[PDB]
Structure 1
């Protein structure tokens, strides 16, 4: 759609005014706010009970009274936390549900921004090229439905693997150097740690396909079809394909627990390797350690 060339400037002019991230980054206090917020959620992404959040944010505010150039309050950091953690809720950076705060997508993106300024993990690498190589191999073999081509690909692949098995039974096995282990660990972190990035936008999409429904059930002050057509159908009445239909199939991957257990055990083994602690700092080795649990329990 080449009318995008004109629509794009309007899109950006609107975004720079509304989207919470791009409003946050332009204020004269974005660094302080982002440093505080990252620290809050830095150690758990399941959401924070409100009282513990108040405690942690109040302690952090005291930790950054070194920036009392902004008159950071020295009297009662708990009251200042009560104020800041609500200012950030009315600004839609954080949202509190079921008694626990969370970080909306509009803060996920913003934090993805600043922490990629200085020292973002390397993407152009050996591991990324190998992974896209293999994925391009796999996707192509799955589209063209010709069975002869499929069986030929399986035959060539199994014969190629036979070479590796024969050479592995012998003593010509080779393993990664230290730096290559570091690189693959960094890569498989930079893939896995992205799965978590869309939940808080799937929820935003569902909480938006509902208003666009009750704003029509109430505009149809005279009509019935747009209600019975839905209710008589047992299908999800709030179905929202553009994200709902993607996320759902991902559940039909998570609940194949047999593979998830293998993933969890493999992650258990990798993080014990000597080179792991050099590739990833402490926090990264925590988040990547708890992936399966903090995916299922999200």
Structure 2
């Protein structure tokens, strides 16, 4: 009994999912992670954490992400973040607290009894009992056929149909729970293999493994997945199953049992399962290819020796005084590598941009904080193109609802690049920041 307590203590100390449960900001993190799986992740996490001060932002988000990566909650391959089984387990536990489909049903008992009978019949090697069981089943089927031909077609009740639908959905949707587990097992097997190779470096083992074309990364989960997908490759029963499901879906009791998302999930079981099964073979192939490429490099002995030397240096580094500037600035002995030259031998595009102009005009309006007409705005911010700007200001004024007067004229003199003069007979406008502060552009 105490062994259970010790194991619980160890699990609380170690398992990353429980640590995520114990995290203070678990709700936001879980919401973000669940939404994403349906670099930029840091952006989304910071944006979500923004309007949740209550109770840095970028720095704290990065620190949390790196801590979780160190905790192996998520993995990083080249530039992308990928999930593990623990994330899905935690998500399931969290969202299961709302509503759970009951299993203690008579229909489940019937299915269990049928499966038990099937197992007991299948495991028997006797050639006589199987024949007797087949005869009994045929006799029972003939009795049922005679009773049906007597006019006793049995139609189940409403509650019975609802319970059957719910149980079928519950049992069917559980096929996709083990996918990440196989990938995690393959990754950990690959890491163990690389550690063994580097620890060993012996070239004979590398040559033998490269010569051998046998599949590496052998785990029982791989064999189970292979058998499952091999039986899944037979579409003959898949078509019948899909047709039966689509026939079932057209029943008046459906809206009373399953919501829209459940019906959508049930409608496309077969193709989705096939595609998901296919999606793992590419990952296995890439893992094997990367392992073989790493083996062909033949630098394991080099890395082993350099690691040993670095460990020796870092062991020596604990016997020096880093509190002295003179010692820290004492030159060492390292030849110059990659020495460059000694500096010298000692001898109608572009057009117009709108966003920048809008932002600068907004900044001027907010900094001045007073009504401004077109003349002053032109003076403070001389334009490159005289047109395409007056129109923009007038459009902003009209859209914002700020009134524009046309009975009076303001004369603005502009000079282009090639000298000369132009005069604009603009009407009068007054621009303020407060009115237009809440309109997108």
Please tell me the TM-score bracket, short chain as reference: 0.7 to 0.9
Alignment of 1:109-128 (within 5 A): 109-128=89-108
1:221 aligns with 2:201: yes
Are 1:89 and 1:95, in contact at CA under 8 Å, matched by a contact in 2? no
Alignment of 1:1-298 (within 5 A): 8-41=4-37, 44=38, 61=48, 65=51, 69=54, 90=69, 92-95=72-75, 103-222=83-202, 224=204, 228=208, 234-241=213-220, 243-298=221-276
Structure 1 stretches of 4+ with a deviation exceeding 6 A read 82-85, 96-100
Are 2:16 and 2:86, in contact at CA under 8 Å, matched by a contact in 1? yes
Are 1:88 and 1:94, in contact at CA under 8 Å, matched by a contact in 2? no
Note the C-alpha offset of 1:201.
Answer: 0.6
CA deviation digits over 1:222-277, x for unaligned, max 9? Answer: 4746873x566543221112x11211110121101111222222222222322222
Are 2:42 and 2:62, in contact at CA under 8 Å, matched by a contact in 1? no
CA deviation digits over 1:83-111, x for unaligned, max 9? Answer: 69956973644556798765421111112
Over aligned residue pairs, what C-alpha RMSD do you find? 3.4
1:29–1:152 CA distance, 2 compared to 1 (3 A): same
Whole-Å Cα distance in 2 between the matches of residues 88 and 143 of structure 1? Answer: 50
Whole-Å Cα distance in 2 between the matches of residues 216 and 150 of structure 1? Answer: 51
1:244–1:277 CA distance, 2 compared to 1 (3 A): same
Note the C-alpha offset of 1:116.
Answer: 2.2
Note the C-alpha offset of 1:172.
Answer: 0.6
Are 2:165 and 2:257, in contact at CA under 8 Å, matched by a contact in 1? yes
CA deviation digits over 1:125-173, x for unaligned, max 9? Answer: 1221111111001011111211111111111112111222222334211
Are 1:89 and 1:96, in contact at CA under 8 Å, matched by a contact in 2? no
Whole-Å Cα distance in 1 between the matches of residues 205 and 62 of structure 2? Answer: 48
Structure 1 gap ranges (5+): 45-49, 74-78
Whole-Å Cα distance in 1 between the matches of residues 192 and 140 of structure 2? Answer: 54
SS in 2 for 1:135: helix
Note the C-alpha offset of 1:295.
Answer: 1.3
TM-score normalised according to structure 2 size: 0.54
Aligned length: 274
Are 1:94 and 1:101, in contact at CA under 8 Å, matched by a contact in 2? yes
Whole-Å Cα distance in 2 between the matches of residues 88 and 272 of structure 1? Answer: 50
Structure 2 gap ranges (5+): 277-441
Whole-Å Cα distance in 2 between the matches of residues 265 and 98 of structure 1? Answer: 42
1 or 2 for the larger relative contact order (CA 8 Å, sep ≥6)? 1
Are 1:94 and 1:103, in contact at CA under 8 Å, matched by a contact in 2? yes
Q: What does residue 47 of structure 1 align with?
A: none
Whole-Å Cα distance in 1 between the matches of residues 273 and 224 of structure 2? Answer: 16
Whole-Å Cα distance in 2 between the matches of residues 93 and 190 of structure 1? Answer: 27
Q: What does residue 76 of structure 1 align with?
A: none
SS in 2 for 1:165: helix
1:179–1:9 CA distance, 2 compared to 1 (3 A): same
Which of the two has greater helix per residue? Answer: 1
TM-score normalised according to structure 1 size: 0.77
Note the C-alpha offset of 1:184.
Answer: 1.0
Note the C-alpha offset of 1:16.
Answer: 1.9
